[PDB]
Write a protein that binds this ligand. Structure first.
Ligand code: HEM
Ligand code: HEM
Ligand code: HEM
Ligand code: HEM
Ligand code: HEM
Ligand code: HEM
Ligand code: HEM
Ligand code: HEM
Ligand code: HEM
Ligand code: HEM
Ligand code: HEM
Ligand code: HEM
Ligand code: HEM
Ligand code: HEM
Lengths: 292, 292
């Protein structure tokens, strides 16, 4: 039942609390975050990538909710979520939880296709992927974590309970969505684009099927459908692109591409993102045969 | 079952479908919208405010999904959700669903205080407030609604079943939130501000307790807490403002107010929005007495 021990001597899993000096008797705070150090140290080889100062200590020893000189007044909020971290001319460039994860999406070919075109969503389910404590923690325990007085045994117990109770959401099967879609809304100079809908989603899914970071944040069964079917409720029958993207110019919606450009930008955007060899963006017949 | 017949003669409630010419055999679309004509016409005096062309005919006779000349190519999506509609110098300026509802939040003092400072949120739960059809509608009926061959009695039956299954979420009691809060995060030149938390919420809630539009859209029990406790999961114990808002301007987040401006902008923002006589924004000591 015990969690697997780390090689490092860090706790296998640890509950991270909103550490600060301002009294917070009512526990006004996000849910604490249980961090799975085991999983992370197996994947990220350099301890100092994260522990950027070289010190094997809790980030909140320096980055408290309100900020303290040891962390150059960089707060807990900033240290955990910062998306725009400047490269340090000298020494280590720190990482945040959010910044490293986002990097994975851009630098790994299997992730960078979809993540070239996704409509970012940082909603409650996004926060909850990390702000994820077991319901068994009491207010009193929340207070001891804030105060640094929780005993390491209780931190372990809460952490283990939480990790043991996590479950990975399974993405809906590509069989529940079209096998192909004959995109013919605009057909004129070319024949329809016979989009291999199932072939596409199956392939994209297969390359990430065991990735623990994707599995944790792809956390609704239909969520991958939003990669293309964006800005509408998750659904097995989403609205057509052309319900929101007009064929002609739409100056009342300056940010929305017209329908041809919508297909081109989205289809070619992923192809570029994940370096798809064929079709190239300059290939004007592989996606749609020339009309008679 | 059947609904209350209207004075106008329109069906008491009407299912609105994604009407257009292009085949949609799989019903790729949002859920149809059940519009409560009865409730609307009892509140809105002039038929022409909505039926801007003067004749009470379905909007999608002119505003199809793809658009067409009889609607000046303004699509069904633009006609229902348009937010930035130009005032017409000749005749009736059209309204959309969204635009009139937004006007309500702005032009009515009981709505305009919170709505001067809320963090706008057009998420799935917002969409579903209107895209709200009974689960009993079958794909075949959806096809007939799209094609305009659904029998009027069938439309009626679907709308009545939908309306009669509607649920209003009750907002949590202000007794579940603090009576008063000593706001002392920044205490220095002034004493802490002893904010009348419960009196504020209770008062704001009292004034909208019977409003059907607010009731539909305020659709999570803790949603009203988000008026002030924004950008975090709905919670009875949200994070402190100062967990995200730093004491001094952070150059890393230069559009995020610092903590003092966070309080001032929020507190004075609603006060201005709903024409609160006192405190004026210059009545400093009213919100925080000078420090002895
Ligand atoms: C989602 C948008 C989200 C929000 C909101 C959020 C807020 C936030 C706050 C305000 C803090 C500071 C402490 C407090 O409770 O006031 C906090 C701290 C941590 N966060 Fe967070 N956070 C959200 C998103 C996420 C995501 C997606 C992750 C993981 C990648 C994450 C991580 C952390 C960690 C770690 C902490 C410190 C521990 C704690 O104080 O709970 N956050 N977050
Ligand atoms: C490399 C193998 C490595 C070491 C060693 C290490 C140590 C370490 C310790 C001793 C702790 C506990 C500190 C405390 O005083 O409680 C700890 C905690 C955290 N670590 Fe770590 N760690 C190593 C690797 C990494 C890597 C690669 C990551 C980033 C992906 C990382 C992150 C963290 C975090 C976050 C914590 C929790 C701090 C808290 O607030 O509880 N570690 N680490
Ligand atoms: C714990 C593993 C930990 C995290 C995570 C963390 C993150 C972090 C961020 C993202 C920054 C950069 C912020 C920016 O806006 O540029 C940052 C910067 C500093 N930190 Fe840190 N940090 C972690 C832990 C610790 C430790 C334990 C301390 C104190 C010993 C600390 C200190 C600092 C300071 C100082 C800086 C500034 C460095 C710079 O080059 O500006 N961090 N941290
Ligand atoms: C590749 C293994 C991969 C990673 C890693 C990954 C991570 C990831 C995160 C962390 C999120 C949350 C939002 C954020 O950027 O922090 C996220 C969200 C979505 N992803 Fe993803 N993802 C990877 C791969 C893929 C693939 C192959 C697809 C397309 C099929 C995909 C799409 C999605 C979508 C949709 C979301 C939600 C919207 C968003 O916030 O981007 N991801 N992913
Ligand atoms: C995720 C599993 C998902 C589902 C569900 C889904 C459904 C869906 C339907 C029902 C159609 C309509 C077909 C018709 O007109 O009869 C459709 C059409 C398109 N899809 Fe899709 N789809 C899902 C996933 C994805 C993904 C991840 C992408 C992009 C890689 C994608 C793309 C498209 C496109 C393009 C179309 C055509 C829409 C149009 O031309 O209006 N879908 N999908
Ligand atoms: C159908 C699968 C479809 C495609 C294709 C499509 C593409 C598309 C692109 C390339 C953009 C620009 C980049 C981006 O994602 O921001 C874009 C922009 C918006 N879309 Fe779209 N879109 C598809 C479907 C839909 C649907 C069904 C809607 C309406 C519910 C919708 C709406 C929007 C909007 C809004 C934006 C603009 C965002 C902004 O920058 O202001 N799209 N889409
Ligand atoms: C090569 C650069 C290229 C050209 C040229 C091109 C043109 C084009 C037109 C004019 C349309 C409108 C429909 C018509 O038949 O006139 C059209 C629409 C689609 N395209 Fe395209 N297109 C070029 C390249 C690409 C590539 C590489 C892709 C696939 C990644 C692609 C896809 C699409 C799709 C989908 C549509 C919609 C088809 C329809 O609605 O009939 N195009 N393109
Ligand atoms: C929430 C952001 C939301 C989305 C997304 C959205 C989309 C949408 C589309 C794409 C259409 C056109 C037809 C289609 O199904 O393809 C459509 C049509 C209607 N809408 Fe809508 N809609 C969203 C939000 C809302 C809300 C909050 C309202 C009510 C104020 C509303 C209303 C309607 C109406 C009425 C229609 C016409 C009937 C229909 O086609 O279902 N929408 N919407
Ligand atoms: C004023 C008292 C008034 C009249 C009269 C009126 C009539 C009416 C009819 C007869 C219908 C049905 C149309 C059809 O052919 O199916 C209808 C439908 C809608 N109405 Fe209406 N209506 C009057 C008042 C108003 C008011 C003030 C509004 C806006 C708040 C409103 C809106 C609508 C809408 C929307 C519908 C449904 C149209 C659809 O596409 O199905 N009406 N009305
Ligand atoms: C457009 C077709 C449209 C839709 C859809 C829509 C929806 C809607 C709902 C879901 C509510 C809540 C109560 C109910 O279920 O009926 C509601 C309430 C009112 N609305 Fe509305 N509404 C649409 C159109 C419009 C228009 C064009 C206006 C103003 C001209 C408007 C106004 C209002 C009013 C006011 C209310 C509350 C009525 C009350 O009894 O207090 N709506 N609407
Ligand atoms: C006054 C009677 C009033 C109305 C009307 C109203 C409407 C309303 C709607 C239509 C929404 C959905 C979002 C949109 O703008 O379309 C919405 C959302 C929220 N409201 Fe509201 N609301 C009225 C009053 C009040 C009052 C007095 C408060 C504060 C106590 C309040 C709060 C909010 C919150 C928060 C939201 C969600 C976030 C957002 O989308 O604004 N409203 N309301
Ligand atoms: C009147 C023009 C005015 C001034 C001046 C003023 C300044 C002020 C300061 C300097 C702060 C920091 C706290 C301190 O004690 O130094 C501060 C804080 C808050 N204020 Fe203020 N303020 C003025 C006006 C207003 C008004 C009219 C309100 C109420 C509507 C108000 C609100 C607040 C609150 C709340 C805070 C935080 C208090 C704390 O954390 O100690 N102020 N203000
Ligand atoms: C909705 C019912 C709601 C809840 C729940 C909520 C709770 C709450 C908490 C627990 C506190 C912390 C108090 C403490 O630390 O002693 C708190 C504090 C403040 N709130 Fe609140 N609150 C709810 C709603 C509202 C509303 C609608 C507003 C704005 C009108 C509001 C305001 C605030 C403010 C300001 C504070 C102080 C926060 C700080 O100084 O960090 N709340 N609330
Ligand atoms: C923000 C923390 C904030 C402060 C501080 C504050 C104070 C304040 C004073 C001192 C009064 C007069 C007496 C009283 O306590 O009622 C006053 C009254 C009203 N306020 Fe206020 N106010 C703060 C915030 C807000 C917010 C964010 C709103 C609207 C969402 C709001 C509204 C009101 C109302 C209305 C009044 C008048 C009395 C009533 O009818 O309840 N306040 N506030």
């Amino acid at each position: 039942a015990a969690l697997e021990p780390t090689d490092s001597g860090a706790p296998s899993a640890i509950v991270m609390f909103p550490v600060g000096e301002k009294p917070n008797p009512k526990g006004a705070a996000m849910k604490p975050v249980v961090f799975n150090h085991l999983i992370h140290e197996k994947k990220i080889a350099d301890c100092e990538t994260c522990h950027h100062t070289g010190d094997p200590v809790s980030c909140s020893t320096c980055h408290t909710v309100e900020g303290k000189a040891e962390g150059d007044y960089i707060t807990l909020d900033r240290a955990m979520h910062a998306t725009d971290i400047a490269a340090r001319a000298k020494g280590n460039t720190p990482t945040s939880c959010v910044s490293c994860h986002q990097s994975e999406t851009k630098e790994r070919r299997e992730c960078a296709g979809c993540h070239a075109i996704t409509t970012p969503k940082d909603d409650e389910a996004w926060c909850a992927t990390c702000h994820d404590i077991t319901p068994s923690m009491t207010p009193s325990e929340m207070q001891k974590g804030i105060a640094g007085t929780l005993l390491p045994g209780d931190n372990e117990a809460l952490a283990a309970e939480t990790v043991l109770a996590e479950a990975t959401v399974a993405p809906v099967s590509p069989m529940l969505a079209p096998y192909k879609v004959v995109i013919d809304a605009l057909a004129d100079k070319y024949e329809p684009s016979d989009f291999t809908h199932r072939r596409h989603l199956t392939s994209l899914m297969e390359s990430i099927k065991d990735d623990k970071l994707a599995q944790a944040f792809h956390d609704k069964p239909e969520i991958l459908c939003a990669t293309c079917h964006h800005r509408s409720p998750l659904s097995l029958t989403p609205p057509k692109c052309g319900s929101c993207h007009t064929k002609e110019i739409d100056a009342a919606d300056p940010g929305r591409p017209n329908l041809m450009a919508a297909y081109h930008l989205e289809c070619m955007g992923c192809h570029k993102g994940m370096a798809v060899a064929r079709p190239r963006d300059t290939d004007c017949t592989t996606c749609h045969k020339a009309a008679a």
